XYZ file of C-alpha atoms in Angstrom:
92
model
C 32.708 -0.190 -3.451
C 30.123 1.294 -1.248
C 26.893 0.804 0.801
C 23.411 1.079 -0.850
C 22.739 4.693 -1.497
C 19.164 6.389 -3.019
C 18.842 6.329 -6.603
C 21.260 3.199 -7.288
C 19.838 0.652 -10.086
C 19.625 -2.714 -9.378
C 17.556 -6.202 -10.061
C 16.100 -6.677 -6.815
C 14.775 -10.049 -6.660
C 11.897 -11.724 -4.626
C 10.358 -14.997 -4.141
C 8.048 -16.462 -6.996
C 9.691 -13.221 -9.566
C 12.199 -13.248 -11.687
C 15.202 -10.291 -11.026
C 13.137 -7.606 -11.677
C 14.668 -3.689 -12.868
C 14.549 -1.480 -9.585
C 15.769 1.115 -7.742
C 16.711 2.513 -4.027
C 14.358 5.045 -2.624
C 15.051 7.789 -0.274
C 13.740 6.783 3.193
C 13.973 10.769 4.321
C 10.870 11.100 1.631
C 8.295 8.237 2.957
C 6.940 8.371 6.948
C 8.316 4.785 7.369
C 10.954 3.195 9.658
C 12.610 0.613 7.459
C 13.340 -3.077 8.718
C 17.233 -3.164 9.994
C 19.438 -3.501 7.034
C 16.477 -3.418 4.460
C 15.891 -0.702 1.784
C 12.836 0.617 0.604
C 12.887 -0.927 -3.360
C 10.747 0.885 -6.291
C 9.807 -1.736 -8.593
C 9.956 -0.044 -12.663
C 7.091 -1.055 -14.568
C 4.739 -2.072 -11.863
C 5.742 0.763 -9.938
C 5.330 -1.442 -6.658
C 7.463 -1.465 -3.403
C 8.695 -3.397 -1.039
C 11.851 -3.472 1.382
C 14.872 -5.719 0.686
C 18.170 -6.595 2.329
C 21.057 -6.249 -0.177
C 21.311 -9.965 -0.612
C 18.761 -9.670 -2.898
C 20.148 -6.499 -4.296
C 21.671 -6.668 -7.949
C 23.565 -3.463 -9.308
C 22.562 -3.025 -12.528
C 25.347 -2.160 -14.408
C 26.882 -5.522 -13.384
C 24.222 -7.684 -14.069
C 21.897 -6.341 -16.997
C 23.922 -8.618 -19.560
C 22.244 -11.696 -17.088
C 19.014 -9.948 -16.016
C 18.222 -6.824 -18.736
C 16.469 -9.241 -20.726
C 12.412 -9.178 -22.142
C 10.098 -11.140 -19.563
C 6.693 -12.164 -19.812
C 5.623 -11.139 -16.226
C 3.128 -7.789 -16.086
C 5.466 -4.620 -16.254
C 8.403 -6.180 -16.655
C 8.988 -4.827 -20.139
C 7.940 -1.193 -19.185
C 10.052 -1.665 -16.293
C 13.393 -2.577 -18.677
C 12.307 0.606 -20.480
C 12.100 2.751 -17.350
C 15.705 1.514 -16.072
C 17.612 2.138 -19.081
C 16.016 5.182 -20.300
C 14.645 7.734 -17.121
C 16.029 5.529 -14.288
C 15.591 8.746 -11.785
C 11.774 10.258 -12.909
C 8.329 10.738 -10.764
C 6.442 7.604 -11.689
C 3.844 8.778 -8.746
């Protein structure tokens, strides 16, 4: 098993959220100097980011039985949509 690489699927998870369907950006694209050890995160279905050490990194495949489940929090429906079904489009 490897380091975080652009275009893995996690649940990245933040205070006050529940694990929410995500993905790694590519750093190379934005004009932004991550944080050490952080990871620019794009958030499916509010189509939001942030950056996030891998602590609170999920890979999806391992944990959608746990987290790939409906929510009641804005976007978080879309966003289980997004994951499963065009993981890797434009949502710009």
């Amino acid at each position: 098993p490897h380091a975080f690489k652009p275009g893995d699927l996690v649940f990245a998870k933040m205070k006050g959220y529940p694990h929410w369907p995500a993905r790694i950006d590519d750093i190379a694209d934005g004009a932004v100097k991550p944080p050490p050890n952080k990871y620019p995160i794009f958030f499916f279905g509010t189509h939001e980011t942030a950056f996030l050490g891998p602590k609170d990194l999920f890979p999806y495949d391992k944990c959608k039985d746990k987290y790939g489940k409906p929510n009641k929090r804005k976007g978080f429906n879309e966003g289980l949509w997004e994951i499963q079904n065009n993981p890797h489009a434009s949502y710009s």
